[PDB]
């Protein structure tokens, strides 16, 4: 379905959480294409740095058959 895999480092800017937090502070996930824009907007607004992103699944510029 032309998913995206992203590595993003999201710091904590308001609260000092006392339990382990690498799993959500520095993570690489697989994001669907439709939700990629919303996810990236959310990450930037939360203040994380998008270290890397790549179209792991799908083919670039597919004029048809992208699902």
């Amino acid at each position: 379905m032309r998913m995206f895999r992203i590595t993003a480092c999201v710091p904590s800017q308001t609260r000092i959480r006392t339990q382990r937090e690498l799993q959500n502070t520095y993570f690489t996930k697989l994001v669907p294409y439709d939700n990629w824009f919303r996810e990236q907007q959310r990450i930037m607004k939360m203040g994380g740095k998008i270290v890397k992103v790549e179209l792991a699944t799908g083919r670039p510029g597919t004029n048809a058959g992208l699902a």
Binding site: F4, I6, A8, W36, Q40, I43, M44, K45, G47, K49, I50, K52, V53, E54, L55, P60, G61, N63
Partner: protein, 161 residues
């Protein structure tokens, strides 16, 4: 993000000293420029859609990109490009209000160059689309606010480079 005031405050706080004469001068400069920036923001909010439409028409329409096999080809990719340029316009206006490029760095530029590299989107074409947006916004706002608006748009294009 940051603005001019927060930028000056952080620049002073990093060495942990009070706002000296230079900081006050910069704050006065931003305070003077505030009225002009607000007026330009009002104008761009007026003509948000039209600026993007004119920029794309003079920059991409009836060109290679819009034709079949181009990145802007197909309704979905046209809508995506329109949305990207609309967000570019809105965030450049945000940066113009704030007086600082930090909003562009941490909200418009991280995760976008490599996103376009992944998608195959034409960076050289989106650069010219942003430049067309700059020309339209300059013609609307005027030379005074237009110069700083173009400064921010050039910052966006350079980061996208």
């Amino acid at each position: 993000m940051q603005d001019a005031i927060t930028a000056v405050i952080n620049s002073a706080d990093v060495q942990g000293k009070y706002l000296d004469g230079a900081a006050m001068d910069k704050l006065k400069s931003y305070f003077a420029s505030g009225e002009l920036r607000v007026r330009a923001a009002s104008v761009i909010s007026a003509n948000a859609a039209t600026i993007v439409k004119e920029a794309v028409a003079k920059s991409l329409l009836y060109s290679d990109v819009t034709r079949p096999g181009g990145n802007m080809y197909t309704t979905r990719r046209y809508a995506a490009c329109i949305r990207d340029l609309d967000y570019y316009l809105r965030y450049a206006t945000y940066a113009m209000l704030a007086g600082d490029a930090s909003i562009l760095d941490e909200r418009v530029l991280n995760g976008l160059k490599e996103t376009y590299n992944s998608l195959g989107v034409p960076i050289s074409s989106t650069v010219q689309a942003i430049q067309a947006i700059k020309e339209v916004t300059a013609s609307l706002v005027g030379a005074d606010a237009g110069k700083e608006m173009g400064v921010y748009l050039d910052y966006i294009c350079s980061g996208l480079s």
